[PDB]
Design a protein around this nucleic acid. Structure first.
Lengths: 180, 59, 197, 141, 33
RNA sequence: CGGGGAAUCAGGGUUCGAUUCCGGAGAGGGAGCCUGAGAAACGGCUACCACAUCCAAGGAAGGCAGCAGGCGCGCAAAUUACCCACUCCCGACCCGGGGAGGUAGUGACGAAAAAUAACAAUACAGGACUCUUUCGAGGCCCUGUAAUUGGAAUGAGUCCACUUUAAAUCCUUUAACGAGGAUCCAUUGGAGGGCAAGUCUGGUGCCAAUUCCAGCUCCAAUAGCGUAUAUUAAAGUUGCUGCAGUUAAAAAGCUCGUAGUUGGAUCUCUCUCGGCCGAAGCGUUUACUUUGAAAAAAUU
C-alpha cells in the first residue's frame, strides 16, 4: 500500500483510418491556420469537442423537465459560455451540436496573443508564450494551449520582467552593448 | 510571490516544548546524536545475545 | 499428476545445474581464473589488486603478480591475474584461459582508445563471463556522483548494453564483488571446451 | 427455426455453448493442447541454440534458395528452423550460439513465399541483428 | 516480380487505373527484420 | 482465490481482474500442540517427510510466498540506500520502537504538459487592387521560397545563493556565463500492384528480360516509431438483438413415441372494541410494473 494516485487519462483518440486525404488535408489546414505542433493537438481538441457533443446528446435524450437535464445542461452551457465558445444568447443544448473545432482552437492563448496584436504571427505568438513573455492578469503563462476565458481576455499583458515590457534587456543586447 | 507557514510563540520555553525537534535544530536550539539506523539496529541485535550488565559492554 | 510431473522435471534440472555450478571453483575442480583488465589509463591497478586480496598465496613474475585466493568462508578458490591493454598476446592469452574477465573503468569516460582496441580484440576472440567495475566514483563530490553513474551508463550502453556497474572503493565492496563473481552464470566457449587446455 | 419462448434461456445458452465448441479459434484457445503443442509454449519469443544452417527452396513460379538456421529451443528442447533477413546477416550467426527467435509475423501462419518456415531471428549473442547489420554494435563470440 | 506483373495485368482487364510498368516493378526495397 | 473493478462500447455482448480496497487461504509438505481474550501462530514449540548448515564425530542449529540482495528459471521485472519528519500502530508511555510507511536511486510499463527556432530588409515567384482596350506602370499591398544579410529574444546546459527537506536531491525563484552550419545537426517505418507515397541511379549474375546489394526521391507519425504474441473491435464467421441448412458447410429413413418449450375465444372490501379514525380478516395465490427503505470507499 502506498499513498499515491493511479488515475489518469489519454486526452486524444487516434483516428480509426490512418490514411484518407480529406482528414489529412483538414488536419493540415488546422495546424497551419493555428500554428500547432502536431496532429496530436488537433486530435486533443477533437476529443474534447466529441466528449462535449456526446454529453449534450445524452442530455437531449432526456425529458424537458428532468432535474438532471436542467442542472447539468445549465452547467455545460455555462462552462461553454465561460470559455468564450458559445454566445450568452445561444444558451440552448441544441446549439452545442453546432460547434466546430475552430472555436476551441481560437480560444487558446496562442491565438489570443496573435489576435490581440502582441505577436506578428501565430508562430511568433507560440515562441513568445513559450519564452516567458506573456502573462494573464498577474501570472506568467508558459502554456500555448492555455484556454482563455472571457473575463481573462482583457488582461493579457506582457510580463513586467520581459525585455520588450518592463525593460531589462536580454542576453544578446547586453552582450552586444559591451563590445563597444 | 512565495507562500509559507508561520508560528509566533508566547515564550521561548513554549517554543522549546511544542515545536518539532527539527525546527528547533534549524535555529540551533537542538542537536541530535550522530548515529545511523544500521548501527543502532545491529547494536540492539547484539545486545540481545548477552544477559545482565554485559549488555552494556557492547561497542 | 501434473504437479508431480512438474516436480520431477524441476528436480532433474536443478540437480544438473547444481552439479555444473559445484564443479567450478570448488574442491573437485580447478581454481576460478579471473583476468583483470583496466580499460583506461587512469586506473591504479595495484590498489585494486590490494582490494581483491580468506588467504592469499602471492605468486609473482618479473613484472606481473598473479595470486591465488582461498576463501572457505564462501568456499571458493580464485586465481587472479592482471593484464594491461595493448599487450596483445598477454591479454589474448590470459583471456583465452580465463573464466571471468573483470573490466575496470574510470568514472569520467568509459574507456580510452587502447581500451576500445583491446575490447574489439576480446570481442573478436570470444568473451567469457565478464563483470564491469568502476573504480573512482567515490572520489568525486557527492552532488555529481549519481549523475556521473547515469552518464557512464551511456558510456557503457554502446558495447555492454544490459549490464550493471559495480563499485570498487573499500574492502566491503571488494567482498561484494567477490560474491558476485563466485555465484554467477558462466559463459561456456566451444573451442576451449572441446579441447583440453 | 429458433425457439423464442420466455422460458427458453437454458436451451438457448446450452445450444450456444456447443456451437461455440464448433469454431476452430474457440477450440484452439480453449482446448489447451495448442499451447501444449506450440514450440514457443504460448510465448512471443524464445531462445535457442543454433544446431546448424540449412537451406529451404522457395515457391515453384519464382525459384529462390533461402537460408535458415536450425535451432533447438532452451526451455522445452524442440527443434525449429528460423529465417534470416539476408545472406549477409547469416555471417553473424555460428553453430552453438544463443539466439532469440520470434514468429514470422501474421499471428502464427506460414510464409506466402518461403514454404514452411515459421520463425525469424531477432537477436544473436544477446545483441540484435538490426544493430549488427547497420554497424551500430558488434557482437561477442 | 512475375506475380505483380500478373496482378497489374489483372487490374488492367478490370479496367482501373494502373501505374506504368517499368524496371522497378517487382523489386525488394530493403531487408526486413 | 472471490468481489469491488479494467478494456472495447450504437444497442446487446466479448475479453480481462496474480496485483496496493474488502473477504479468504498459506508460510518447504503433512500433523500435534503450549501460552493467551484471541493462534491449530510458523521472524512460537514438537515430531515425521524432503532438502540443508557448523563439528574436535560426542553433538548443535534450520525455514525470504517481509525489505533489500543472490542463484535458478526463463521472452519477461529495480538499491544488500536514507528516516521515524508525514500517515498511523504498539508499549508501563506527551519522551521508546516500527524495511508498516515515508524519501531518494533504477525505471521510454503507462498517462499529462511541452523545445529543436522567430522577425526585418533585400532578391526572385505567385495573388489581389488603382490607372490603361491590352501590353504594361505600380517607393500599391498581400503571400511564399532563400548556397543573401541583420541584430533582437530565449531555453538545453555550466554554476553562487535562497527555497525544498528529518538531512538532502528534483521542481519553483534568482546572480554570472551560455546560439548561426543557432554542428546546441530527430528519429522510426513504409512506398516504383490496392488505402499516404517514384516514368530515378549505380554495381552484380541467367537466357532485352532478369538474383543479390548500395543509394537518391517521396510519404506518414513524431520524442517517439517498428516488431512478435495473445486478445478485443471491425464480424451479422456463434447471430438474444442478429446468420444460415434445393443447387455453395448443413433437414434426422419415416411416422405413433413421456419430460422441456409453446398453447384459441370469453367474466365492468369490511367486521369488532378504544379516540370521521386506529388495531383485526386481508381481498385466492403469484409473475409483471411503479414507489420507498436499506446497501463500503476508491473506480465510472
Amino acid at each position: 500500500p502506498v499513498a499515491r494516485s493511479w488515475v489518469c487519462r489519454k486526452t486524444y483518440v487516434t483516428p480509426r483510418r490512418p490514411f484518407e486525404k480529406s482528414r489529412l488535408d483538414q488536419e493540415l489546414k488546422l495546424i497551419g491556420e493555428y500554428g500547432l505542433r502536431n496532429k496530436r493537438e488537433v486530435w486533443r481538441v477533437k476529443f474534447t469537442l466529441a466528449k462535449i457533443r456526446k454529453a449534450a446528446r445524452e442530455l437531449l435524450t432526456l425529458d424537458e423537465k428532468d432535474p438532471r437535464r436542467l442542472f447539468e445542461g445549465n452547467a455545460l452551457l455555462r462552462r461553454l459560455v465561460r470559455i468564450g465558445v458559445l454566445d450568452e444568447g445561444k444558451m440552448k443544448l441544441d446549439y452545442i451540436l453546432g460547434l466546430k473545432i475552430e472555436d476551441f482552437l481560437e480560444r487558446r492563448l496562442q491565438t489570443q496573443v496573435f489576435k490581440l496584436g502582441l505577436a506578428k504571427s501565430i508562430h511568433h505568438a507560440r515562441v513568445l508564450i513559450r519564452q516567458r513573455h506573456i502573462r494573464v492578469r498577474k501570472q506568467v503563462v508558459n502554456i500555448p494551449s492555455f484556454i482563455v476565458r472571457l473575463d481573462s481576455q482583457k488582461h493579457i499583458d506582457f510580463s513586467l520582467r520581459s525585455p520588450y515590457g518592463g525593460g531589462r534587456p536580454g542576453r544578446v543586447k547586453r552582450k552586444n552593448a559591451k563590445k563597444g | 510571490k512565495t507562500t509559507g507557514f508561520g508560528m509566533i510563540y508566547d515564550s521561548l520555553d513554549y517554543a522549546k516544548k511544542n515545536e518539532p525537534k527539527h525546527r528547533l535544530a534549524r535555529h540551533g536550539l537542538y542537536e541530535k546524536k550522530k548515529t545511523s539506523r544500521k548501527q543502532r539496529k545491529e547494536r540492539k541485535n547484539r545486545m540481545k545475545k548477552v544477559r545482565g550488565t554485559a549488555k552494556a559492554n557492547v561497542g | 499428476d501434473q504437479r508431480h510431473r512438474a516436480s520431477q522435471l524441476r528436480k532433474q534440472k536443478k540437480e544438473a545445474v547444481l552439479a555444473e555450478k559445484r564443479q567450478l571453483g570448488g574442491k573437485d575442480g580447478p581454481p576460478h581464473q579471473v583476468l583483470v583488465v583496466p580499460l583506461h589509463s587512469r586506473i591504479s591497478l595495484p590498489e585494486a589488486m590490494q582490494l581483491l586480496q580468506g588467504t592469499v598465496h602471492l605468486n609473482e613474475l618479473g613484472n606481473t603478480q598473479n595470486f591465488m585466493l582461498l576463501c572457505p568462508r564462501l568456499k571458493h578458490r580464485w586465481f587472479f591475474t592482471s593484464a594491461r591493454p595493448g599487450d596483445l598476446h598477454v591479454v589474448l592469452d590470459m583471456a583465452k584461459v580465463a573464466d571471468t574477465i573483470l573490466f575496470l573503468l574510470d568514472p569520467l569516460e568509459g574507456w580510452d582508445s587502447t581500451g576500445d582496441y583491446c575490447l574489439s580484440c576480446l570481442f573478436a576472440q570470444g568473451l567469457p563471463t565478464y563483470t564491469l567495475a568502476v573504480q573512482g566514483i567515490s572520489g568525486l563530490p557527492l552532488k555529481k556522483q549519481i549523475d556521473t553513474r547515469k552518464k557512464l551508463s551511456k558510456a557503457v550502453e554502446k558495447r555492454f548494453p544490459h549490464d550493471k556497474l559495480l563499485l570498487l572503493d573499500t574492502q566491503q565492496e571488494a567482498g561484494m564483488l567477490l560474491r558476485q563473481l563466485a555465484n554467477q552464470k558462466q559463459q561456456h566457449l566451444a573451442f576451449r571446451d572441446r579441447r583440453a587446455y | 427455426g429458433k425457439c423464442r419462448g420466455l422460458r427458453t434461456a437454458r436451451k438457448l445458452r446450452s445450444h450456444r455453448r456447443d456451437q461455440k465448441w464448433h469454431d476452430k479459434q474457440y477450440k484452439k484457445a480453449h482446448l489447451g493442447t495448442a499451447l501444449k503443442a506450440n514450440p514457443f509454449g504460448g510465448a512471443s519469443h524464445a531462445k535457442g541454440i543454433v544446431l546448424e544452417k540449412v537451406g529451404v527452396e522457395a515457391k515453384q513460379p519464382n525459384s529462390a534458395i533461402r537460408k535458415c538456421v536450425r535451432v533447438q529451443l532452451i526451455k522445452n528442447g524442440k527443434k525449429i528452423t528460423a529465417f534470416v533477413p539476408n545472406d549477409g546477416c547469416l555471417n553473424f550467426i555460428e553453430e552453438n550460439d544463443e539466439v532469440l527467435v520470434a514468429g514470422f509475423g501474421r499471428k502464427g501462419h506460414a510464409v506466402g513465399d518461403i514454404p514452411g518456415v515459421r520463425f525469424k531471428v531477432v537477436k544473436v549473442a544477446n545483441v540484435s541483428l538490426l544493430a549488427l547489420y547497420k554497424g551500430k554494435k558488434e557482437r561477442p563470440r | 516480380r512475375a506475380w505483380v506483373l500478373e496482378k497489374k495485368e489483372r487490374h488492367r482487364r478490370q479496367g482501373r487505373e494502373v501505374r506504368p510498368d517499368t524496371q522497378y516493378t517487382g523489386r525488394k526495397r530493403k531487408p526486413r527484420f
